Design a protein around this nucleic acid. Sequence first.
RNA 1: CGAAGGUGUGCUGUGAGGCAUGCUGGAGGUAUCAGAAGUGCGAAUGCUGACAUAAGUAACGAUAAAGCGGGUGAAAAGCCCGCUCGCCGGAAGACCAAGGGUUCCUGUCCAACGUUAAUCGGGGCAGGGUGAGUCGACCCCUAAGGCGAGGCCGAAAGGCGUAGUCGAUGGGAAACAGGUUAAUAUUCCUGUACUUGGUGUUACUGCGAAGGGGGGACGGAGAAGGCUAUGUUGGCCGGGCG
RNA 2: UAAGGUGAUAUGAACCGUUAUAACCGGCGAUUUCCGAAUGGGGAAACCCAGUGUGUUUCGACACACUAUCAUUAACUGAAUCCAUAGGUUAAUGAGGCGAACCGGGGGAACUGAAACAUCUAAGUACCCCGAGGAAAAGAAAUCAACCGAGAUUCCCCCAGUAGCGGCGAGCGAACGGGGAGCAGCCCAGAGCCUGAAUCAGUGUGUGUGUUAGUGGAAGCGUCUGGAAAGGCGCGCGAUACAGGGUGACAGCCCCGUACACAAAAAUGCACAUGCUGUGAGCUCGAUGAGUAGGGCGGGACACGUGGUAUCCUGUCUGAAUAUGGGGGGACCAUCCUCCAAGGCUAAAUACUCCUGACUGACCGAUAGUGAACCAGUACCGUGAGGGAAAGGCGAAAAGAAC
Lengths: 62, 93, 46, 77, 102
Amino acid sequence: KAKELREKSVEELNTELLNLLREQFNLRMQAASGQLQQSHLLKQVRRDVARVKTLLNEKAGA
Amino acid sequence: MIREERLLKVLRAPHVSEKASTAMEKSNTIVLKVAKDATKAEIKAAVQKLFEVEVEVVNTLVVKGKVKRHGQRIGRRSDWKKAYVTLKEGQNL
Amino acid sequence: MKRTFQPSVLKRNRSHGFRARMATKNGRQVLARRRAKGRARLTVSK
Amino acid sequence: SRVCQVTGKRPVTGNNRSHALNATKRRFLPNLHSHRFWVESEKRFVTLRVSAKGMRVIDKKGIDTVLAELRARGEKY
Amino acid sequence: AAKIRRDDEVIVLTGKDKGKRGKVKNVLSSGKVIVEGINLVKKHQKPVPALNQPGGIVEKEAAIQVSNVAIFNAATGKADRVGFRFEDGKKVRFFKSNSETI
RNA sequence: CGAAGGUGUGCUGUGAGGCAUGCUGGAGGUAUCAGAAGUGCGAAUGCUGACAUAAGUAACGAUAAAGCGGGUGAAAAGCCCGCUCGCCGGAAGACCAAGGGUUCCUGUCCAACGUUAAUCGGGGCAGGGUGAGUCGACCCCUAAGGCGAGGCCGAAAGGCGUAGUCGAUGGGAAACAGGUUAAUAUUCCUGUACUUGGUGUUACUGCGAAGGGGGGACGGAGAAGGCUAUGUUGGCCGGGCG
RNA sequence: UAAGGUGAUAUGAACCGUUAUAACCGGCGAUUUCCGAAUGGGGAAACCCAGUGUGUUUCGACACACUAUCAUUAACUGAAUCCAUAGGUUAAUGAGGCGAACCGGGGGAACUGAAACAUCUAAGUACCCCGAGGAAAAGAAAUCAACCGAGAUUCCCCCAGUAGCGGCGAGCGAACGGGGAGCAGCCCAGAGCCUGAAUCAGUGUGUGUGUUAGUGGAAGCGUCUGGAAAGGCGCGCGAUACAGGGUGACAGCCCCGUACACAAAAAUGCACAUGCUGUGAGCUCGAUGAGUAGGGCGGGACACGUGGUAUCCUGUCUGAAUAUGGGGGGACCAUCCUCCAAGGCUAAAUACUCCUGACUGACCGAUAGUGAACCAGUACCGUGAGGGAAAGGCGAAAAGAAC
C-alpha cells in the first residue's frame, strides 16, 4: 500500500490518516460490544495507520 | 482535548454492567471504559463529538486491577479508568 | 507485646528508598551490587 | 586541602619510629602560609596559599613567572 | 529449498505404512508431514456442549517424518531422491534417478 | 533371538571377588594388556532426602452457653430461616488515621486451607463494585531537621555552610438535610446553599514589591455564668382493654 | 529466500499468501511513553508543579520547542573605586553516568608465622579512593662493565635459593653475566641557506580480501527378526564428502548437513594505489633544562631492618659548577673508565575477558556441574545491607483413554 500512498501529498495523507483513525474507533466500538466477528480488521487498520505515519515522517523533510 | 486525534483515542469501550444499565435507565448516564490519562474535559469532548450527544457532566474513577492466578504464576490485570457521562436528555447508542 | 517492626511507608521510603540510596556514594554502591546480582526488586520502593 | 599552589607539596605519610623501632603511621605536613603578593603587572594583591619553599621559589623566579605557571596549570588564584 | 512441497505424491519408506502411496496434505514446520490415508490413528474424541459436540472414535491422520517419505517417480514407479538445479532462471526440482524435472 | 540397571537361584576362588542362569527392564555394554583417578563408608552430636518410635498417646487455643422446629443437601451440633436461652454494652457497639491490598458484593465448587464435619468461609473459580469545586491528598506557607550554586575546609572519598530549596505532626476558601444499590456516597438523585479565580460589559477610581506597619500568633491552673448536644416528665396523636 | 505463515505456553477464531511486498533472514532508516547521570524546579524512582517563545482557537483551551550544573573561549556588561578588577547576562564547545578483568597512582590493616612476643613476618596483601586505554606503565643512559666491551624500555629461561639482609631467629633474597621474543628512534628549549623535499594525523576515490543474509553439493536395494530397521544375510555404488545431528533399534548412499565450488543491492573493516587541509625534512652556526645537583634533620623505596652503607624519593631548613664543568663506578680518598640530571614524545614482544563465533576435553551428568538443565538471584527470610533453596525424563507418535 505504501507504493500507492507515496503518490498522495501531505494533505490528502492527513485526511487518509484521520479516516483510518475514525475507522479504528468504529471497529473498537463493534469489537468491545462483542458484535465484530471479523477480528482481523483491527490489525489491518492499525498497520495502515503506522504506514501513513511513516510516510508523513518521511515527507516531513528528514 | 481539542485535537480529534486525541479524541479518537480517549474512548475505549462501553461498560455492560447492571449498575451501568440502572444508571442509564434512571440517571441518563452512560458508563465507559476510557484511557488511564483521559481527563474529564477530554471525555466530554470525545463523547460530544463522536457520539454526537450533549453532555451534562462526567464523573471518573480508576479501577485497580486484580491479582489473578494462572497455574503457579501470579499475574496482575491492568488498571483502567471508568467514566460516568451524564447526558442531558438525548441518547442514541 | 510491642514488637520491633512498626511499619510506616514514609519512614521506609526515606530510609531505604531509591532516592535515599542515590543520595550517597555508598548507596549507589549498594544499587550497583544489587543490579550486578540481578535483583528483581532493587529497593523497598513499590 | 593543605597543598602549596606554587610547588604542589601535599601531606605525605611516613612512620614515627620509636627507640624500640615501633613504627606508627604519621603525616608530614608542609609549611603552608596564606600570603598576599603584590603583583605589579596588575597593580594588585593576589592571595595564594604557599609553602615557605614556594615563597623562596617566588622570590627567585618572580611572581609573574610563577603565576604564569599556575594559570598554565589551571589553579584559579 | 524443501524437497517435499504441499501436493506431491509420495511413498512411505519406513513404518507400518511402508510401500503405501499417498498425496501430501500439509507440511508442518517441525519436519513432519501429513499424507492422505497413511498414518491412521483412532482418537477418542470427547464430546463438548458448544461446537463439534458429536463424540466418537474418529480415525484421522497423524504426521510422519518428512525423511520417512520419498517422492514417487511414476515413470520408473519407485521411491526416489530429489535434487535442485536452475532451468531458464528458476530453482526447479529434478528426480535424482532419470534426471528429469518434477 | 534382549544391553545397562533391579531381584532370586546355582556354581566357583584363601579374600576383596568371579561366573552362569530364571524373572523384571527395554538400550546400551565392553574382553585382553596398558594408562589416569573426585576409586571402596558404620560411626565425624557429619550433610541432604525419605521413613519409623514414642502413639492413634498429648492437644484441638480463654469456663460468655446453649436447646428445639423447619429448609437445602449425598450427608447437618457447627450453614440458612424461626422461637427461646446466655454474654458485651467507656465495648466484644459505630467511625477515622496508620498498616494491609480485593479480604468488599453476587453466582458457583469443597481436592488443599479452616486444629473436627462442612452444604459454610477472609478458601478455589468467575463476574461485578470504589463517581467530589466543598471530604483527604496535591496546592500556598513554614517548624525540627535535610539538601545546598558560589564559599570555607579536608590525602581521595568527603565535612560544614550562604543565598535558596525541600521538609507536617502545625496555619491557609467554600455543603447540609432527605432518597437510593447486592456492594459508593457530604461524591449518585431530589431540594436548598456556599467558595475562589478567568474573561466580558458597565460605573467610579490613583494603582503598584524580593520592601514598611497590623493580624495570623499561641503557656499552666482555676472558677464560674450563659447556653446547646442529650435525657426525663407532661401535653397531643395512633393503637390496645390483655 | 520462499510455499507456507500471523513468537511460546496453546488449543480455537479472523485472516494472509501459493512465481512474488505472506512469512522468515541480513544492511540501511523511521518510531522509540515514563523513571533513571535525569539536565525547567521539586520529590517518598517511574510522580507533582511550572516559565519563555513561536502556531492554532468555537474563546473552552490546545500542540511543538527551549529553559539544569560546571569547565574553557569570546562578546557585551560592571561595584566598593578614578582608570581597573571581582562580579552579571548571553553564545559556542566539552564533561558528568554505567561496566567483569587487566593498568598507573593516592591511602592502607589485622588475623597469622616467629611454636609467647615488641624489631621482623603476614604485606604494600585484603580493602577504600582517583584516573586512562585497548591495552596501561616504562622507554632511547648524568646505564652497566672493567682497562676488554656492551649499548632504550618490556616479557620468558638461567644466573640462584647463590651474594647478601636478618631479635644473623622466623624468614626475606638480588644483581653482574648468558640464551631467547621483539626491535625504532625522535623532538623542543633557535637563527640562517634551503620553506613547506621527511613525516604522521584527520577527511574523499579505484582495485583485491573480510564480516553482517545466502546457492548448489555424490552414492541402496532385496530378504529375516522385529511394534517399527538404520540390526543380521546377500549383492551394489559415492567418497577432496566415513565431522556431527535427526529419522519408530546402531544409516557414507532417508533427511539436515560435511568436502568442495560459488554469492552482495547496502553498510563497513583491512591492504595497497590515491586525494584535501594542516604538522614540517637537510646542511651550517649556536644553545644545550638552579631553588636544581649537593648538604643538615625526619621518614620511605631499593633483596639491604642504619650498620662501616654507596645509590634513589622527599616533609623541613639550606644550597653550587654550569663543558677549562658535572654525575656514577656500594664507606672515603687518588688515578682511570664511563655517561651528561634538573623539558617532552614514541609501535612490537607483555596483561586481562563483561561480550561474540568456531572447535576441543581419559571434565559433571540432576545431592554432580554455575546458586540456578525447570519462568532463579525466583519462592522464602530480614527494617536494611544482605542471605537464599527445592524442583529434569509418558510415549516413536497424544494415538493423553469415545462409550
